[PDB]
Amino acid sequence: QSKYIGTGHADTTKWEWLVNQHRDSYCSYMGHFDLLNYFAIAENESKARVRFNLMEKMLQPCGPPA
Amino acid sequence: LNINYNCEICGNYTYRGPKAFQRHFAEWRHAHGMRCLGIPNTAHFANVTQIEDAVSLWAKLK
Amino acid sequence: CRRIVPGQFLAVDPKGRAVMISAIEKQKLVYILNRDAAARLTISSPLEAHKANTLVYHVVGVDVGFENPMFACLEMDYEEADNDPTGEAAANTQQTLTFYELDLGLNHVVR
Amino acid sequence: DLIFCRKQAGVAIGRLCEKCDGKCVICDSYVRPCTLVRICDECNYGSYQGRCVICGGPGVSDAYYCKECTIQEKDRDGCPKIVNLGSSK
Amino acid sequence: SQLLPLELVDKCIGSRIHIVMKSDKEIVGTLLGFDDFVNMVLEDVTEFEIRRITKLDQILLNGNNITMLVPG
Amino acid sequence: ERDTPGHGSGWAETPRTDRGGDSIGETPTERNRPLSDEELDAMFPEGYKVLPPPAGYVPIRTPARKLTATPTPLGGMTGFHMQKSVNDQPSGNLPFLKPDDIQYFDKLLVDVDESEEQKERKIMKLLLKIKNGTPPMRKAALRQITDKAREFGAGPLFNQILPLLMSPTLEDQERHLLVKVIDRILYKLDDLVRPYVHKILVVIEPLLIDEDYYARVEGREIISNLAKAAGLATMISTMRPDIDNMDEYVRNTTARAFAVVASALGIPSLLPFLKAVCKSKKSWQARHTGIKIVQQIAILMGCAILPHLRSLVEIIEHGLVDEQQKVRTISALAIAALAEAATPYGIESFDSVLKPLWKGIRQHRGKGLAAFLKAIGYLIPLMDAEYANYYTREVMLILIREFQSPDEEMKKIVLKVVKQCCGTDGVEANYIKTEILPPFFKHFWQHRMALDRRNYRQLVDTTVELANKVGAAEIISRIVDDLKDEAEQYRKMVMETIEKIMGNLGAADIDHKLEEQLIDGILYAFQEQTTEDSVMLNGFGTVVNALGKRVKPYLPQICGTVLWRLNNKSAKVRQQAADLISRTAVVMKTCQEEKLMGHLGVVLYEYLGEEYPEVLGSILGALKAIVNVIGMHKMTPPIKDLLPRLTPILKNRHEKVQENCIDLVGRIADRGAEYVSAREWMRICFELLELLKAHKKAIRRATVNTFGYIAKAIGPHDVLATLLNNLKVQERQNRVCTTVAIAIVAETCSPFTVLPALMNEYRVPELNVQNGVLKSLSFLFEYIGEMGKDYIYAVTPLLEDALMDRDLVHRQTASAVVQHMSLGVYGFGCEDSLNHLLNYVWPNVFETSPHVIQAVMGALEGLRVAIGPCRMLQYCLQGLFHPARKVRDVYWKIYNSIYIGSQDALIAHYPRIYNDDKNTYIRYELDYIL
Amino acid sequence: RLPPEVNRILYIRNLPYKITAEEMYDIFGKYGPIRQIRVGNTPETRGTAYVVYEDIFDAKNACDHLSGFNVCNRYLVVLYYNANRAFQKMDTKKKEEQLKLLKEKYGI
RNA sequence: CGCUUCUCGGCCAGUGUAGUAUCUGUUCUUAUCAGUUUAAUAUCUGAU
């Protein structure tokens, strides 16, 4: 369980849980080709610049911890 | 109980019982010293006494 | 689609010997290939590159003709980025290029 | 004392003895064999060539997984070659 | 509780036996079988006057002239 | 204290130097060594006075020796005289005290309270309830100590065990148990054990180096549990000084320790230490050890050594050249073991090793020599048969010249080598045929060898591989003539060898004349069997099934013996010949020798009145295999005769019977099953029913499957009605097998029939049969799968009742039903109900009762796949952060189990979450609208 | 010709709590010179004693004849004392002086 | 072994490893504050 990421425990902080689901949101968005294309259409960029941006936002999302 | 003991990370505090120490570890102030020290909470650090060793342990964590 | 399970990025050698496969994060495995007795393609057993808390931007087969093969894992660690209450490690981390190196004879894979 | 090795899942077919022979390994059960067992030659090697994935005797057959463990997708975790408390080998 | 003699012959089947005629002759070989009249099948039997012959195979010994049977 | 400790070592050997030198100049001129009052205050525990009676008293004592000879020779003799007692001495215990043990448990010769530590020691004699007494005492006492782990602390414990795990007279059972206590408390104490660690190994390490197989494996288990349990630097800082300890024993073992601690904490942790050791320049004894360590690492970690291979070797090379011998010796030996875990890998890592090795090979005399072989031999498989080609061609010489030694260490070695050298693809056939064989069969095949164990095996192997190359008839030809050599173990050997060979190579090569010599042989052996052993028997079977219809001229001689033996010779040998038929059935068939099938059928049929179990068993076995060749309707004891003839046997109590019988009955009631009028069957039913008292699994196994077969023959209602009555008194899950009948039955005609009977039968007030019916549903759905899409409704309300309490067990088992249902239905659209049930499940979440919980985990996991997450997750939100610990413990454990599977799905189902000051928890993406 | 376990020590029990070193020294005195004795003077060990001789075979003759021997109205449990165990209350230190001494006088 | 008589019948206290549940008996609802502890209690730890 532990070496399988996204594992929680009862000490789980708010922040960590949410950052988790962010990241996983992302590897989905890189995953599901369409969903990606959806984003691309909406906010006009490349597919690439999308994926790139995302892979920037990976570690950050929500901003610094507490 | 009523046996001399000391926790180093907490104010070099004194504890009179060994059962008391586990309770101190699952504690508000003990976790405040850890987390505010930069050593994050819960169950990996339980056996801590001195401030120094758990710093390299936390470097092993991250 | 996982965060940790391969199939996302995929790379493979010029000489076809071995092929590396990877998720986005944490897992990079490698399957070696050699044609059978009759030269029909037999698949090796896997291997593992595991490295904790490491983002793989992109992977590419490498060229070394008839060597121990190489791969390029573009990486970044976020582990600095978590344990920085400030938000400095947010900046001032640079993505780490590493070449992994298959090694047949020893048959593991070494950073 | 008795728990999995869960080292990585190779191509090596599993091997079971007389005793263990029917059992879908994790669901303990005879029901509905469908799909097939893989373990690491690390787990499975040498004296372990055709060794029981449980008891340490010679394998006379090949464990099939249940369907139950199938849809719960467990068969794909680390290689179920049980290590006892003592050194496996 | 009584021990029947035919039961004693039965258990010495496949063993070595000495068969003692009412005359001065004796045969030792493996007891293969017997009937109710105590005719007897011996295997590879030594024939003695108290060594005449080494028999090879199977001998039917006529129960008629048999006096004593000895297991061993 | 550590520095202190080693100080004490250099002490010890400085002393042995003083004494040994004192008899070195004294020889130029032990336990009995006299003692000092500090030394005398060193042994006895606390709490004793020394005395004086008097300086006149202690003067006579001083006079004692001088007056022990003096008054040894003087006058005395002793005289009894012919002529309200008290004082009953208090001895023994509930588990009782052996006489010797008084010394330990003496303080249970006092009877008091009010002494505090001493109340903890005096309470820790709970041991004795471990060491001796009744099994239940052992159990309960054992836990009582486990939960008292933290409390008394190690110190008192090990203070009070290690005497016993040291007991000069300690029992083996007592040993193993007291180990159990050491493990079990070592699941708990972690930081605690530190000061005790060495003070543990000292007992244990002997156990690790253990003749008994199960002994060792325990030992290793706990030395890990300790080493991992304690800290690495603990283990090290502990265990240096045993390296240079004078006794080779303690080194030896000390290694195997380090082997284990290394399996625990990984090599690379530990390397720089080792690598330090092998460069220790003080003395060799270390290096002898450190190298050994490399080895036992090799052996243990085995196939996994692979990655640091190169480093390890990079240690060990600097040995081979050493001035001291052993260090050479052991060293190389390690290289061997390495490669043997290396298999065909890492060749060039060994690389820089060779060129000494080859040279070393030349110049040697002795154990070391053959050792270097042990290596090279294990190398060759790792080379390139061009390079390997050359180097091979050099060795096979020295190998030749060396067959002949008297050394057995040798013959093992050179043997295993040949396996490899001439065990090669890149080696040429004839060459072996000429140079090697004639020696080989000469010096090796001898009666020295086979009496020993290993050599037996290793031999067989080797010869086999020489077959796999030079062919079959070559070998077998030369060893046939020895089936008729007298002594058994030898014969046994040739026999198994052949068996394999015609295993691998195939019979097809063998000529004719030789073959006559086979079968004549394989009888001649088979006719004389000290014990009944699988060897000759199997070895035969394979012989025949290989020869196929080449065999045919030989039957009459076989079956002739088969019968002759079969009879007499008194019964012990009978079962053997029986089996012999068992295996050769197939051959008696396809060749179409039917008169044979008349013979066997009927004459076996007679023995089924044989009273010895161990015959009748093998008898039936023969019958079974006889059935699998000749079909039913051609059976010469046509079934009508037979099957009843079996029927009464089922009482037989004894094992092998019940096995082969129920097996047989099964085959026949499956296949023919018409031959026998129904009435007979229903007798069979009411006889089966108590076969479910079987201690054994397999009996019940096939038992059930039969129960089904007949249930097909007749039709269901009765047979479940009949099963409904059965298994009333089965103990703790023994009856369940009956339930398994209800299941399999319920398939083998449309279950769609049977339920109403079943369901209704949950009405009955008798509790345990209620839960029985629940499991019935359990296995039931597990066995039906898709079909559940119907009767689901039927059960659902019932699951509601049972699932609502009477007691746990209701909730446990029922919940299991939910599981197997929930998988089976999958995605046909019946969720709605399953949602409904989810409710009455849900509250069960909380309990400590292990079976109830791992049951529930079962439930919610399956239910996940049926309902889907999103619904689940909608039960698991609120739980995560709930203030309490208890709830968070669990709702997390659930949410994990949801989480690992279907992580990919979730994304949708995390709800919106409002972003705070330092952070943004709203994922803005999804709201981009075109 | 001896079992290895037995040692110059014997555990000795079934004693009265009045009983005399005079009695003791005398009786045990038969087999050989006493290295020395201890008597449990303590709440628990009142009733038992240890005995140690200048030789084992001394003690062997002892456990031989004194086996179950009588004193007063009691039969003394007579046992070869175990060893190792709890002693390490002391430490091995105090070589240095002595082994320098043999180092010195004899020069060896 | 055969015949006769009588009776009855058949056919047209095992064991082993792990673990939970449930009764009864015994002790406490009892002075303040300081720490550990708990969802909150409780419980545990000191002195008047």
Numbering used by the authors:
A (entry chain 2M): 15 to 80
B (entry chain 2F): 402 to 463
C (entry chain 2I): 112 to 222
D (entry chain 2L): 7 to 95
E (entry chain 6d): 10 to 59, 64 to 85
F (entry chain 2G): 300 to 328, 394 to 447, 454 to 485, 490 to 1304
G (entry chain 2K): 12 to 119
Give the exact sentences the study uses for this entry.
For two of the four ED spliceosomes, the overall conformation and protein components are consistent with those of the ID pre-B and ID B complexes. These two spliceosomes are designated mature ED pre-B (3.3 Å) and mature ED B (2.7 Å). In the mature ED pre-B state, the RNA helicase PRP28 is well-resolved but U1 snRNP is too flexible to be modeled, likely due to the ATPase activity of PRP28.18,28 In contrast, the reconstruction of the mature ED B complex shows fine features, which allowed accurate modeling of the core region, especially for the B-specific factors. In the mature ED pre-B state, the disordered ACAGA box is positioned in the vicinity of four proteins 27K/RBM42/SNU66/DIM1. During the first step from mature ED pre-B to late ED pre-B, 5′SS is released by PRP28 from the U1/5′SS duplex and captured by U6 ACAGA box, and U5 loop I recognizes the exon 3′-region. SF3a120 enters the tri-snRNP and interacts with the U6/5′SS duplex. In contrast to the RNA changes, the composition and conformation of the core protein components remain quite similar between these two states. Notably, the location of the finger loop in the early and mature ED B complexes is occupied by the β-finger of the RH domain in the ED pre-B state.
